[PDB]
Design a protein around this ligand. Sequence first.
Ligand SMILES: [Ca+2]
Ligand SMILES: [Ca+2]
Ligand code: NA
Lengths: 311, 64
Amino acid sequence: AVPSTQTPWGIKSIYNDQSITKTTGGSGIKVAVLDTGVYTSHLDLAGSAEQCKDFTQSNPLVDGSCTDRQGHGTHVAGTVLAHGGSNGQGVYGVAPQAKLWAYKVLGDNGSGYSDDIAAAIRHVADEASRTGSKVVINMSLGSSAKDSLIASAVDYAYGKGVLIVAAAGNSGSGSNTIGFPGGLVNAVAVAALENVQQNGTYRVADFSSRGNPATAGDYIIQERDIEVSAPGASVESTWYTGGYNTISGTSMATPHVAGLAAKIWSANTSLSHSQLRTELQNRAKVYDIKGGIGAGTGDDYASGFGYPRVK
Amino acid sequence: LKTEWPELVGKSVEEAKKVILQDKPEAQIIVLPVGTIVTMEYRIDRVRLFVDKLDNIAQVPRVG
Ligand SMILES: [Ca+2]
Ligand SMILES: [Ca+2]
Ligand code: NA
């Protein structure tokens, strides 16, 4: 199988180059995709998985298993780091030289248990500290309500130098519908753009969860603030049966940002996770988003600080 | 065009399903326990219902 294009719209968009046919970057960084599992033997993911662990079984950690029976986790991972395959004809993600830690925390219908997610986050942090690795967590998952067990795990991981990138939610366009863990102070909440222009910029998709209007505008992240926006509507990527699929959500926006984070980090390995986060914020501000319900000039509760890009 | 049913919070799952299907007849309705963590895929034909132990709706149902 081949994708419809080796560089889906979101990839071309975040690269700010409609002409690209391949991507590069992310060497030396790990992206932990905490999701439905990943089909690590997909041609466009082969050799990327350095860890493959399952937190969903009767045993609380099954090492060497991370099987995707859903698709979502495979799709997310491809956006981060698909590398076009050995023969170069496959799909490309943002950071094709990054390595993958595939942690299965959701079951095969795309739902899971708080405890498994929290255990998985803490485990990433422990692995990061032990191995001295630079790690970005991707969590294309959540709940409308704040879950404090997950929040405790996120703070633990952030305290051990792991960047956390998480979906804002799909509860829009109503204000203050942001979910968790995206809405945590120490997670980067990612809103979803669609491939439409409004008010001179990309447009936030109506489905994307909005932050709290009361605390947007200050370019300082509080709980329930959107941080950045990325391509999230009609995103083609790798699929668990070996081909490709096109799905939507803040799920798909999140890995554009996790991937971009890995790309940036690889290009300056002297950065800490919080310096990396700060530079995501700085880049976002270069591309202020003004399109979509609640979007406007400056930091806003639809799109946060803006749209961080390669250039 | 209906994307949320805030009036269904506290109603039974059977009632919720009737109301949702009246607006969205091809809805794929999935029932999950309150507190279940989920993917953030937006699936336009889906409506998830989160329920308490009495099968009452625990949070605003939404498309996606
Ligand atoms: Ca703020
Ligand atoms: Ca803005
Ligand atoms: Na946040």
